[PDB]
Symmetry: D2
Subunit: 329 residues, 4 copies
């Protein structure tokens, strides 16, 4: 394939580090070697995260098109919109953000801390609620040229390139390390993160080793979006092969009870990971994929001796909108 055909706008410090989770691995029996790739520490732009890796490939187009405003959308504690607000500021572009409450949740400071607080400080015009279209038009009607960034960058022609590159990066680091990882655990909701990885690893025959962990609580739909985006993306990078449904793995056992709400297992995994490795995860995304990986290692689902690369996508700031649950740890 050929990812290099598309220009990448640098928004990250460079490749993200891989760290061993020796303590957590030993805690769970030492029969499986866990590692984490820190996408959550990839940028100095408001904490970054996977979304920022996705955006490096959308910005060249936004600039080429002469757009002067980044417009996006997400739930109240969306990580995507906060990263988009930080990139706009950094790029010298205006920013319009359509925030909808996508979660059946109602904490007192939900719309004033964490991600959305940062977006307002970063200068974004945060509009709390046709939602999407009205925003885009309003920009034109005001004399601007908006660049449309769909939820999570996922349903965008370029939204899948960022993680095809992740696979690339991983091969290079694997070479450096002198070994390869057997599986990759990643949280999936809108889909272009796992889709990019599916494609990038298809290139070396490990697509079905990318273990997605649904956090949408609507697996069928999510599973479909990953499959779709992947096929489209694989076509755009000239993957010498078509992506099959068998290339897509999405575990649905840890998404409950709803998108945006943690279950007791989610909280326990967040606590265990934090307390054994000093690495925080959130109750919406990463805590769910962390919960999945921990559970997998525990049920002996990984063969003894495997090397699992947990992709930490970010999300930590949302912790602030869930303060009551964590009041005592």
């Amino acid at each position: 394939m050929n990812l290099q055909r598309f220009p990448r706008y640098p928004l990250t410090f460079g490749p993200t580090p891989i760290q061993p989770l020796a303590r957590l691995s030993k805690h769970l029996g030492g029969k499986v070697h866990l590692y984490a790739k820190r996408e959550d520490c990839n940028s100095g732009l408001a904490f970054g995260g996977n979304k920022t890796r996705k955006l490096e490939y959308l910005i060249p187009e936004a600039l080429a098109q002469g757009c002067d405003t980044l417009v996006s959308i997400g739930g109240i504690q969306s990580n995507q919109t906060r990263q988009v607000a930080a990139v706009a500021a950094h790029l010298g572009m205006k920013c319009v953000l359509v925030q909808e409450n996508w979660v059946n949740y109602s904490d007192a400071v939900y719309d004033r801390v964490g991600n959305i607080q940062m977006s307002r400080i970063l200068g974004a015009d945060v509009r709390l609620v046709r939602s999407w279209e009205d925003a885009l038009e309003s920009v034109r009607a005001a004399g601007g040229k908006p660049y449309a960034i769909p939820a999570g960058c996922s349903d965008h022609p370029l939204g899948g390139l960022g993680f095809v590159g992740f696979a690339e990066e991983v091969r290079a680091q694997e070479a450096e390390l002198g070994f390869k990882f057997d599986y990759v655990v990643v949280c999936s909701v809108t889909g272009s993160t796992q889709a990019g990885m599916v494609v990038g690893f298809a290139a070396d025959g490990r697509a079905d080793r990318v273990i997605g962990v649904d956090a949408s609580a609507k697996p069928a739909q999510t599973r479909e979006q990953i499959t779709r985006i992947a096929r489209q993306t694989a076509e755009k990078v000239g993957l010498e092969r078509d992506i099959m449904r068998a290339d897509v793995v999405l575990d649905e056992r840890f998404a409950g009870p709803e998108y945006g709400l943690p279950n007791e297992g989610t909280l326990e995994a967040i606590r265990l990971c934090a307390r054994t490795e000093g690495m925080l995860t959130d109750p919406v995304y990463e805590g769910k994929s962390m919960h999945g990986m921990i559970e997998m290692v525990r049920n002996g689902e990984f063969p003894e001796g495997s090397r699992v690369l947990y992709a930490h996508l970010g999300g930590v700031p949302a912790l602030n909108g869930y303060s009551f649950i964590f009041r005592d740890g």
Copy 2:
């Protein structure tokens, strides 16, 4: 000088990046070139920050002594205690944190968001006392250390901000060195450094590190304590102790320790309108966030210094972003509309 004599436990990703603040530099007139060295992005351990650079030199001792618990102290939104808590978990050590409201402030969620929330999730024993308790007076610090022993553990004592500790200033001497190595990879030199100062060993380490090449008075400290006299004295003292510790064959002069006092108001922990405007300006031009307590104050200082033409034209100023952003969560009302 010889910092290499002291072992350093890795708690960071390695050297921290320097980035140009081109948009902000331009917005202010383009006369001064501003950059930021991102200490705020130095670690995977709960956002890390400057305190984490300091801890790298204390942990080897804690480990050699066979300590199984890290004990520290700080205000409700202390960044230090949050870093201590993550480093502890990472090392397989317990952690006890003595905390109290050290600010004349009282936001509804102050003790349940940001830094302290993370410390609890990280598994620390967060002993937050009610107002009027006065830990510093009852010396709750020592009682916590005793209770660890009492419970059969061996505590490693880490003072406020890590500063007033024999090894507390080594991390930032390392900073000056690192900066020298990057100035070489880059091919040019930084003329000044702007750093926020409260407990002092950050700026102290820098002073010792940069005196080694005649640039100590180029470290422009910006007080965030609102108690300049004490702070300046603490920095000076720590610098001299550290200088001697690393074999800096030179005295630290009063002239080597620079601490501006114009941006600390109105009190430790409380931002002024300038602080807020600085935070917003920097955030909106560079996508780089700063906080109402520490960095927003040193950002405000740097911006104001440039605006008043206090920097010689053409100067390259290296803003040291020490971290602290998680504390914004405790000041939500103030930023409710941006």
Copy 3:
């Protein structure tokens, strides 16, 4: 019957006013005349409410027994514990409250505003279960040299817990005398049960026990219905009800308690807003908003005979509104 046999310690201003809800009645068509009796305005003790009417008949025993501490219990935003804390302070007694997280709700300031905030200011020892509490609480008092008067949840499951509301019916009769007519029905929110229990007994006296339409807010209908029926019969015996409480005497509509105790549904919110906007009378998302929702739907469904006169008992609970701030951020 003879309620007068049991002493009553003055904790309220006196009989509670009945106010017509003309705007709401008219807004709903005008076929049913809606009224509200203001139990929520019955006292100067931290806003009072239905529980403080119940407490007037329990305090004399507590004083009689020489107790020096009132101990009670309830959820985080419990109205009961707040009234207990205020009543205790007013009587010169200490107070210990066991508060447990009884609602699947997580709001950042849930344990720091409203009812619980007041209890702390009132001087109560507010003990939050982790995250046996009750007996440790009582014993802690004994161990301290004091003597506790145990007040169960909502003052309900206690020998005297049904008396307050028997008198409520007594009050309504005296007011109907001045009004020249009798209310056709009474709407009351029910959870621990002794409020509706006293009313059932109180109105059974003049054959209207079945006119007391309880609205379940517990989301555990069966249990609640049983607790009312049981507490009713016991109270009936305690006063002298010259009749027996039949299973047909206890009415409890289960349609408005959803989704769970302590959580409002969309109808609950509409009801709160409608009533507050047409009458300037506030209700809460846990209790009164649910009974209000019931009455409005009842009227709207033509379940009340045209021309009926319905007495909505407003039991209080408004301070809990503070624990649901996000839901009402825009009204």
Copy 4:
């Protein structure tokens, strides 16, 4: 004088009760007998309070004038605005509130709990910052606005309510068989104490009305009370001039600023709540409660005096200062 000349629209349950504060009185020495007239329990309209007694004299005018929308203004945790919203709904009138950031206080839920929360639930259009703007906004919208200034105070009828309060107290002193020697009342916008001064000037006790400033700008507050007392004395036919000696305003307990409590404020709120079960707030009543307690403690009240504390309301604002009371 004659207040009866002016119509009053019933917004309250009727005369407010007076209660003995025996426990508190005993705690402070037993030398001074303290009571509380509960204006905070005067109405079914979202807790009411002193502002509600005022509004009873302004509503008739609004109605006569055929107004359809009540417009008022106040700080974020304003009690006045919440009462106007309640009265409004009750009268079937629209309501527009100009809520300003009048306090140097930063709390995460300050604009979402307590008084303002109620105003929104009550259907009022709550605008966060303008006065003239909102009024015009109403007209331009096709409605007729009735303007209610901050605290109902600087208004022709704004002083009538509390003249009535002195009337009520006289009638109750008659039933009790004794008279109070002083009244303690918290003052900020002024017409509450003004009405009292005029009401009690009638029987020679205007100077026994002891106002405690909570504005932290005693100068302006004292002048507003005086000016309003004069206009109001004229309106009611008081046959005397209001002298500066008739306006007592203690400045010692207002600190550090309007809307912010001091430690004495907090101590006072706790003491009163813990001895009587009567709550007070950190902006208004807690400050007047603090004042009364201190006065007693200093022996400033002659032994044997009966002091009627006027509890103006304000408790819901407690929700905006949650952190301060987290441990009691």
